[PDB]
Amino acid sequence: MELPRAFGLLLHPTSLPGPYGVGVLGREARDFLRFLKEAGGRYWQVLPLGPTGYGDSPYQSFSAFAGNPYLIDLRPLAERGYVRLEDPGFPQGRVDYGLLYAWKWPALKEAFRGFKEKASPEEREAFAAFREREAWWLEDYALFMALKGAHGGLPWNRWPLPLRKREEKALREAKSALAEEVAFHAFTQWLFFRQWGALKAEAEALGIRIIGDMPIFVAEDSAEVWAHPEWFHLDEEGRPTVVAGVPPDYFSETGQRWGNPLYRWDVLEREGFSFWIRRLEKALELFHLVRIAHFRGFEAYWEIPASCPTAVEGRWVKAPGEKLFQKIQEVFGEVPVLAEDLGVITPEVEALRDRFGLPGMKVLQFAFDNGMENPFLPHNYPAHGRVVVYTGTHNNDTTLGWYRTATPHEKAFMARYLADWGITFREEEEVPWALMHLGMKSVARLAVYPVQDVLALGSEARMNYPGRPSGNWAWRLLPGELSPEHGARLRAMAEATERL
Ligand SMILES: OC[C@H]1O[C@H](O[C@H]2[C@H](O)[C@@H](O)[C@@H](O[C@H]3[C@H](O)[C@@H](O)[C@@H](O[C@H]4[C@H](O)[C@@H](O)[C@@H](O[C@H]5[C@H](O)[C@@H](O)[C@@H](O[C@H]6[C@H](O)[C@@H](O)[C@@H](O[C@H]7[C@H](O)[C@@H](O)[C@@H](O[C@H]8[C@H](O)[C@@H](O)[C@@H](O[C@H]9[C@H](O)[C@@H](O)[C@@H](O[C@H]%10[C@H](O)[C@@H](O)[C@@H](O[C@H]%11[C@H](O)[C@@H](O)[C@@H](O[C@H]%12[C@H](O)[C@@H](O)[C@@H](O[C@H]%13[C@H](O)[C@@H](O)[C@@H](O[C@H]%14[C@H](O)[C@@H](O)[C@@H](O[C@H]%15[C@H](O)[C@@H](O)[C@@H](O[C@H]%16[C@H](O)[C@@H](O)[C@@H](O[C@H]%17[C@H](O)[C@@H](O)CO[C@@H]%17CO)O[C@@H]%16CO)O[C@@H]%15CO)O[C@@H]%14CO)O[C@@H]%13CO)O[C@@H]%12CO)O[C@@H]%11CO)O[C@@H]%10CO)O[C@@H]9CO)O[C@@H]8CO)O[C@@H]7CO)O[C@@H]6CO)O[C@@H]5CO)O[C@@H]4CO)O[C@@H]3CO)O[C@@H]2CO)[C@H](O)[C@@H](O)[C@@H]1O
Numbered sequence: 001m002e003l004p005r006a007f008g009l010l011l012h013p014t015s016l017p018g019p020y021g022v023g024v025l026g027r028e029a030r031d032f033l034r035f036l037k038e039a040g041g042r043y044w045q046v047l048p049l050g051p052t053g054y055g056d057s058p059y060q061s062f063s064a065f066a067g068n069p070y071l072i073d074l075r076p077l078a079e080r081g082y083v084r085l086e087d088p089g090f091p092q093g094r095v096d097y098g099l100l101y102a103w104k105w106p107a108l109k110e111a112f113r114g115f116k117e118k119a120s121p122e123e124r125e126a127f128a129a130f131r132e133r134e135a136w137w138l139e140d141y142a143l144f145m146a147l148k149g150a151h152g153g154l155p156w157n158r159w160p161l162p163l164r165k166r167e168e169k170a171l172r173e174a175k176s177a178l179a180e181e182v183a184f185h186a187f188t189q190w191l192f193f194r195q196w197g198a199l200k201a202e203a204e205a206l207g208i209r210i211i212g213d214m215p216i217f218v219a220e221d222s223a224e225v226w227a228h229p230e231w232f233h234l235d236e237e238g239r240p241t242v243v244a245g246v247p248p249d250y251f252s253e254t255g256q257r258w259g260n261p262l263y264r265w266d267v268l269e270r271e272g273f274s275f276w277i278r279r280l281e282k283a284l285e286l287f288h289l290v291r292i293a294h295f296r297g298f299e300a301y302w303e304i305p306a307s308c309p310t311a312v313e314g315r316w317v318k319a320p321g322e323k324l325f326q327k328i329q330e331v332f333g334e335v336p337v338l339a340e341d342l343g344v345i346t347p348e349v350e351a352l353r354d355r356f357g358l359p360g361m362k363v364l365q366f367a368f369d370n371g372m373e374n375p376f377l378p379h380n381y382p383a384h385g386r387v388v389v390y391t392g393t394h395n396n397d398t399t400l401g402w403y404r405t406a407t408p409h410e411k412a413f414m415a416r417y418l419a420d421w422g423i424t425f426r427e428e429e430e431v432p433w434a435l436m437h438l439g440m441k442s443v444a445r446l447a448v449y450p451v452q453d454v455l456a457l458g459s460e461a462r463m464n465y466p467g468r469p470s471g472n473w474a475w476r477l478l479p480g481e482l483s484p485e486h487g488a489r490l491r492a493m494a495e496a497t498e499r500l
Pocket of ligand 1: 373
């Protein structure tokens with residue numbers, strides 16, 4: 001791919017400011033792209049954009065192809081008379097996902113009813129054309145969501161067996177009984193992809209590329225697992241026999257049990273990796289580069305027996321990553337993938353990554369807890385520069401929050417290392433920009449920073465706190481918080497480090 005030397009910002013669209021309780025694909029998104037352009041930035045990174053469930057995590061989606069209806073801007077629909085909007089009592093600066101679930105779904109339904117009453121034949125034609133182009137995944141997704149609502153939110157593998165096991169007559173009759181709910185969910189997808197497409201075109205007109213994200217493993221309760229059980233290790237009741245995770249390995253004593261279903265890679269290979277080709281094909285309609293979380297799972301993955309409550313009694317299983325990425329290269333003529341390669345990886349994983357020229361990642365918040373041999377320190381970055389450096393990711397605290405809770409060793413070593421690189425600070429509030437400066441001085445081709453660190457916000461603005469049940473994925477910008485002065489300061493730092 002060869003990345004230019006540049007910088008960008010990490011901002012999930014839910015974090016955009018604006019009315020009605022959540023960031024959406026509208027005027028404030030265009031304002032952020034203009035801000036990014038004026039700052040000299042060339043990349044916008046987001047988290048996965050699929051529909052979310054309990055816990056609101058982007059990394060556990062009801063579909064590997066669908067888009068998130070919570071990101072739909074309702075204002076264009078109200079300006080055309082499809083729906084009336086009135087704020088039920090949302091906070092600003094934070095998504096209330098409980099209130100969003102209770103209020104925004106009814107609002108979208110009214111817009112759909114109003115749409116069918118006044119859409120105009122021309123808008124009805126775009127909708128009809130969308131349903132026919134996307135039918136190969138949309139039929140299953142729309143009926144999945146329709147059945148989900150009709151069964152009170154139960155997962156698919158708890159529905160009545162004729163529906164759980166996708167009997168022809170059962171599905172045909174359900175599709176007829178739920179015809180209007182199916183059409184409604186198709187309507188939400190049409191709106192999402194229409195609005196995202198306009199935003200992608202605006203990004204391209206401003207010289208900006210979008211980095212998306214997808215988890216290597218899909219979610220248990222999802223349309224593609226229900227419709228394609230043969231791709232996964234499931235029993236007859238539709239429940240996983242083994243689950244994803246990682247072993248203890250001298251950083252944890254218990255490892256991690258994620259619970260995701262695991263691919264039958266022999267089946268995927270016999271099918272020419274069809275699922276993965278289509279998954280990446282759809283992703284590249286939205287993004288220019290695609291990050292894949294837990295990239296190492298393409299070389300080998302930790303298999304946990306489903307009945308086990310921890311990850312200690314698993315085993316490593318090789319996956320055909322080499323064959324998969326040869327196929328991707330053949331189909332697409334290039335591999336537009338970014339490897340999430342944090343945590344200890346093996347030579348086999350590095351060789352897979354580097355054979356196809358894929359950039360890896362560096363996270364500066366992990367660089368100071370040892371040493372000078374720590375690979376996240378910039379003098380250790382590869383001379384070819386094919387890495388993306390972050391201060392922190394969505395899973396980390398903000399950099400001010402991290403500094404406030406860091407160990408004495410970390411804080412002292414960070415200050416000395418920065419000083420060795422000509423960067424000093426007097427107050428804690430200056431640490432986020434100090435570390436952003438260090439990343440920009442490095443040989444990493446791309447430096448990408450969370451917007452919370454541009455604003456030097458504390459832990460109250462942390463996007464996700466792994467292991468914490470509630471309060472995640474909810475931080476939002478306030479109107480005007482990201483100012484032209486922030487942008488000019490970024491541009492000056494980019495000029496100084498040869499990133500414009
Ligand atoms: O008391 C009691 C109580 O109880 C209760 O109550 C309660 C409850 O319960 C609760 O819940 C609560 O509630 C609440 C809540 O919370 C809230 O929220 C609210 O709610 C709400 C909601 O939310 C909303 O939503 C709504 O709801 C609604 C909905 O919407 C709808 O939909 C519906 O629902 C429905 C649905 O639909 C359905 O489905 C159903 O559901 C159901 C179901 O079915 C069931 O099942 C259940 O669920 C469940 C599920 O299923 C399951 O699955 C689960 O899930 C979950 C889970 O569990 C969890 O966990 C979570 O998850 C998540 C997480 O968290 C997050 O975080 C995420 O994650 C992710 C991420 O993000 C991403 O990023 C990724 O990550 C990953 C990655 O990628 C990978 O790769 C990995 O990584 C890793 C690695 O691997 C490893 O390795 C590591 O690494 C690391 C390491 O360790 C470290 O160490 C470091 O290292 C480093 C260092 O540092 C440095 O230094 C370096 O080193 C180096 C050095 O330097 C040098 O020096 C060297 O060294 C050396 C030396 O030198 C010598 O001397 C020695 O040696 C040495 C060595 O060599 O070198 C070195 C090396 O180089 O470097 C290094 C390296 O690097 O670092 C590293 C790195 O990092 O680690 C890592 C990291 O970690 O991994 C990762 C991970 O981990 O991915 C991930 C994933 O995978 O995400 C996730 C997900 O996605 O969550 C989940 C979920 O989401 O579970 C669950 C449960 O839970 O159930 C359900 C239900 O429930 O059905 C339903 C029905 O409903 O509807 C609804 C309604 O109704 O709304 C709501 C409201 O309204 O609220 C609530 C309340 O209100 O709470 C409560 C209370 O309050 C009862 O109730 C009562 O009563 C009682 O009382």
